[PDB]
A paper describes a structure:
Here we present high-resolution structures of the A- and B-capsids and in-situ portals of human cytomegalovirus. The portal proteins are believed to orchestrate nucleation of the procapsid through the formation of a portal–scaffold complex, which facilitates procapsid assembly. During the maturation process, the disassociated scaffold proteins are expelled as the viral DNA is pumped into the capsid through the portal located at a unique vertex of the icosahedral capsid. All three capsids possess a mature icosahedral shell and are distinguishable by the inner capsid material: (1) C-capsids are filled with viral DNA; (2) A-capsids appear empty and are assumed to be products of aborted viral genome packaging; and (3) B-capsids have a featureless inner core consisting of scaffold proteins, likely generated by an unsuccessful initiation of DNA packaging.
Using high-resolution C12 portal reconstruction of the A-/B-capsids, we built the atomic model for the main body part of the portal protein pUL104, and showed that it consists of the wing (residues 52–90, 168–193 and 239–286), crown (residues 91–167, 194–238 and 570–647), stem (residues 287–314 and 528–551), clip (residues 315–322 and 485–527) and β-hairpin (residues 552–569) domains. Furthermore, the portal main body of the A-/B-capsid locates ~20 Å inward; in contrast, each of the 12 monomers from the portal main body of the DNA-filled capsid rotates inward. The portals from the A- and B-capsid resemble each other and are arranged in a symmetry-mismatch fashion different from that of the virion: a C5 10-helix anchor, a C5 portal turret, and a C12 portal main body. A portal structural comparison of the DNA-free and DNA-filled capsids shows that the scaffold fragment binding cavity of the portal is closed off in the virion capsid, suggesting that dissociation of the scaffold fragments from the portal is necessary for the required portal conformational changes during DNA translocation.
Residue numbers in the entry:
A (entry chain K), B (entry chain L): 52 to 320, 488 to 635
C (entry chain J): 250 to 320
The structure:
C-alpha cells in the first residue's frame, strides 16, 4: 500500500465535466466550447492530410502517360486556333474532377463507415479542463485487420468504376490507407465508469489505470504541485471555475428568494392555470400557496419588525461572466470572428494557432502524424468535397498540367510556325 | 545554523501562483496572462532559429550543382520564348517546396516527440511574479544521447525519402540538431513540491535548493531589499496584488451579505427547485431557510432599531480592475492589438519588444542562443508550416535562385542573340 | 446502456432492434449519465424560465383584489 495523491474523482474535478457540459450552470459563452468540440474538423484535417500525401506522388510522369489514352479517346484537334485552346482546359477539368470524385467517394466511404468515433469531442474537454487525457488502446485479433483490408478493396472499387487512372494512386498508397484506417480504430478516449487517474508523489511519473489495470495516458499540460497537497491546475477552464460557481450560487439564491416572498403580506405574532377561466384560478391560487404566519414565544420582550424586498440582479454579472468566457476562449485559442459589414458574431471558426494547439497533438498521440499536414483555415470552412479540389490545387498536380499545356501548345505552335 | 531571509514559501508568494492561476482572484484580465503563457511560440521561435541557421549555409554553390540533375530529369526547353520563362519558375517552386516539406517534417517530428515539455508556461509565471525562476538540470546516462542520435536518423529518413538534396543540409548540421535536441531535454522548470529559494543576507548571492540539495537558478529581476527584512518586489504582478486582493474581499463580502439578508422580514426582541412545481416548492422554501429572530436580554433599557439594505457594487471596481490589468500588461510587454475596422479585441499577439524581454532570456539560459535569431512579430502569427517558406525567403536561398535564373536566361539570350 | 459490456442497444416492445449512435454520452460513477448533446446544455435555463413563467402567473393571480386585511 502506497500513498499517492489523486486528481480525478473529487468534487472540484468531477464537477468540471458537469459544468463544462452545463449540468449545474451555463451562460452565453458555453456555445464557444461547443464550436470547439466539432468532430468534423477531425475528419476534414485527416482527409486533407491523406490527400496531400496522396496527390503529390506521380504528378511528374503519369500526366504525360495518360495524355496518350485520351488522345485517341477524343477524336478532335483538326485546327490549332480554336480547338486546341479550348479542348485542353475541358480535358484537364475532366481528369481532375474524375480523380476528385474517385478519391472523394473512396475517402467518404472509409471515413463514414468507421470514423464516427466522436472521441475528439471528449478529447478537447480533457485537454481543456485537466490538461491531460486518459485514453485506452483497444486491441483485437488480427482478423479485423483482414476485415479492413478486404473492405478497402470494395471501397476503392467505387473509384475504379468512376476512374481507371485514379486507382493507380490508391494501389500505390493502400499501405498508407490501411495504416491510417488501423490507427484510426486503434485508440479510444476511455469513456468508461470508475476510471481513476492520479499523480505518484515519490516519483513524479503520473499514470492512468482503468478498473485495476494500468493503461497508457497522454499529458499536454501538467499542473503545478506544492505543499498544498491538493495541487493547482494551469488549465484554462479552472481559471474561471469559481466565477461560474458564484453565478450558480446567485442563480439558486435568486430563485429561492423569489419563491420565498411570493405571498403579498406577512404578519408576525402543470399548465392548468392558463386553461381554466380566472374565477377558478382565484379559488385555486388563494388555496394553493396558503398564508402562514411566523412566531416564537418571548415574554415581556416584544417584537419590533423590519422588512426587505429585493431580488439580486442576475443580468449584470451574467453579462460579466459571458464577456469573461468570450475573452478567455478568444485568448487561449485565437478564434476568429469573420462577419459581414455591420455584422455581429456571424460565424466562429478554428484558426492557425488553434489547430496547432489542439488538433496536431491528437494526431501526435494517434501516431499517424508522420506524413500529414495541418489544414489552411479558410480551407477548413469549405465543403467536405470541394476541399480536395483546392488540395491538389495547392499541390504540383495541376501545376504540371500547366506544364503539359505549355508543352502541347508549344509543340503545335512550332507545328504551325 | 545560519540566518537567511526566505522568499518562496510565504503567504505573499504562495498566494501569487494561486491568484495568477485564479484560485482566489479573477476578472476579464486573466486571459491576457493566458495569451502570455502560450507554449507554441517557443517551438515556433526555436524552429525559426534552426531553419535560419540551416538555410543560409550552402546557398551559393549547391543550386548550380543540383541544376544539373533536374536538367536531365525534365526533357524540355526546346524554344526560348515560352519554355524557359515558365519552366524555371515552377522548377524553383518545386525545389523550394520539396526541401521545405522535408525540413518541415523532420523538424515537426523531432519537435513533437520531445518538445512537449510545457515548461515555458511556468517559466513566464516565475518571470512575472517574483522576477526569477527556479530550475533543475536533470542529467542522465549518455545512452539517452545515443538514443537521440539514433532517433534523428530515422527522423531525417522521412526527409530523405521525399527529397535527396534536403538530406545534405541535415547531414552537415546534424551536430547542431543533436545539440539543440540534447539541450532541449536538458533542463526543467522545477515543478516539484517542497522547494525553497531565499536570499543570503551576509553575502548577497541568493540561491535555490531542492529538497536539501543546492541547485542552479536564474535571475531576471532581483527584488530590492532594505532594513525591512521582508523585501519588496519590482515585478509586474506585485504592482497589482493588493487590488485583486481587495476585489476578492469585496466579492466574498458581497456573497456573505447577500446570503445574510435572504429572509424578507426581520424582527428583534442541486436543481431540485426547478423540476418540481411551485406548490411543493413553496412548502420546501419556508422550511428550507427557517425564520430566526435575534434577542439579547437587557432590563429597563429597551431596543430602538435601525435597518440597512445594501449590496456593494462589484461592477464599477471590476471594470476598474480589468482596465488596470489591460493597461498594465500592455505597458510592461508591448502587446499589439490587431483588429479590423470598427473591430474590438480580435487578436492579441507578441510584438518585437515582448519576445526580446521574455523569449530570448529563456534561450539565453538554454545556452542554444549562440546560433539562433528572434522571429519577426507578424511571422509569429503565421502557420507552423508556412513559416519556413518566408524564413528562407528572408534568406539568400531563393535570392540566389533569382541570380541563377537570370544567369540561365542571359546564357540563353546570348544563345539566341 | 448495458453496464458490463458498453454496447448500448435498442429494443422495441420486447424485441431487440437496430439503432444508430452519433454522439454517445459520457458515463461515470453517477449512474445517471451526463449528456454531451447541444440541447442538454440549456435544459436548466428553460426550466428556470418556465418556473419563472408559472411563478409570475401564480403571483399575479394571487394579489388581484385591491385591498387585503388580516384578522
Amino acid at each position: 500500500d502506497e500513498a499517492v495523491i489523486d486528481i480525478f474523482p473529487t468534487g472540484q474535478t468531477m464537477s468540471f465535466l458537469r459544468l463544462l457540459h452545463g449540468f449545474l450552470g451555463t451562460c452565453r459563452g458555453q456555445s464557444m466550447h461547443q464550436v470547439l468540440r466539432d468532430p468534423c474538423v477531425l475528419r476534414k484535417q485527416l482527409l486533407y492530410g491523406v490527400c496531400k500525401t496522396l496527390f503529390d506522388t506521380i504528378t511528374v510522369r503519369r500526366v504525360a502517360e495518360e495524355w496518350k489514352l485520351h488522345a485517341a479517346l477524343f477524336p478532335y484537334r483538326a485546327l490549332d486556333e480554336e480547338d486546341l485552346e479550348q479542348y485542353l482546359l475541358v480535358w484537364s477539368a475532366s481528369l481532375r474532377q474524375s480523380v476528385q470524385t474517385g478519391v472523394l467517394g473512396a475517402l467518404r466511404d472509409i471515413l463514414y463507415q468507421y470514423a464516427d468515433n466522436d472521441d475528439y469531442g471528449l478529447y478537447v474537454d480533457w485537454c481543456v479542463t485537466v490538461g491531460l487525457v486518459p485514453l485506452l488502446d483497444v486491441k483485437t485479433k488480427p482478423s479485423e485487420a483482414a476485415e479492413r483490408a478486404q473492405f478497402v478493396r470494395a471501397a476503392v472499387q467505387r473509384a475504379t468504376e468512376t476512374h481507371p487512372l485514379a486507382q493507380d494512386l490508391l494501389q500505390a498508397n493502400l499501405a498508407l490507407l490501411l495504416q491510417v484506417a488501423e490507427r484510426l480504430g486503434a485508440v479510444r478516449v476511455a469513456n468508461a465508469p470508475e476510471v481513476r487517474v492520479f499523480k505518484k508523489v515519490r516519483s513524479e511519473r503520473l499514470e492512468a489505470q482503468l478498473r485495476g489495470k494500468h493503461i497508457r495516458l497522454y499529458v499536454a499540460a501538467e499542473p503545478l504541485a506544492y505543499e498544498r497537497d491538493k495541487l493547482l491546475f494551469t488549465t484554462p477552464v479552472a481559471h474561471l471555475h469559481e466565477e461560474i460557481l458564484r453565478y450558480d450560487g446567485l442563480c439558486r439564491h435568486q430563485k429561492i428568494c423569489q419563491l420565498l416572498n411570493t405571498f403579498p403580506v406577512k404578519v408576525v405574532t402543470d399548465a392548468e392555470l392558463y386553461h381554466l377561466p380566472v374565477l377558478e384560478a382565484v379559488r385555486k391560487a388563494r388555496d394553493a400557496a396558503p398564508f402562514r404566519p411566523l412566531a416564537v414565544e418571548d415574554n415581556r420582550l416584544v417584537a419590533n419588525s423590519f422588512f426587505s424586498q429585493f431580488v439580486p440582479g442576475t443580468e449584470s454579472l451574467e453579462r460579466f461572466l459571458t464577456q469573461l468566457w468570450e475573452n478567455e476562449y478568444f485568448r487561449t485559442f485565437r478564434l476568429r470572428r469573420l462577419v459581414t459589414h455591420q455584422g455581429a458574431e456571424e460565424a466562429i471558426v478554428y484558426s492557425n494557432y488553434t489547430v496547432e494547439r489542439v488538433t496536431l497533438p491528437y494526431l501526435c498521440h494517434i501516431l499517424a502524424l508522420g506524413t500529414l499536414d495541418p489544414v489552411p483555415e479558410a480551407y477548413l470552412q469549405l465543403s467536405f468535397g470541394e476541399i480536395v479540389a483546392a488540395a491538389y490545387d495547392d499541390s504540383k498536380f495541376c501545376r504540371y498540367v500547366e506544364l503539359i499545356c505549355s508543352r502541347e501548345k508549344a509543340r503545335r505552335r512550332q507545328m504551325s510556325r
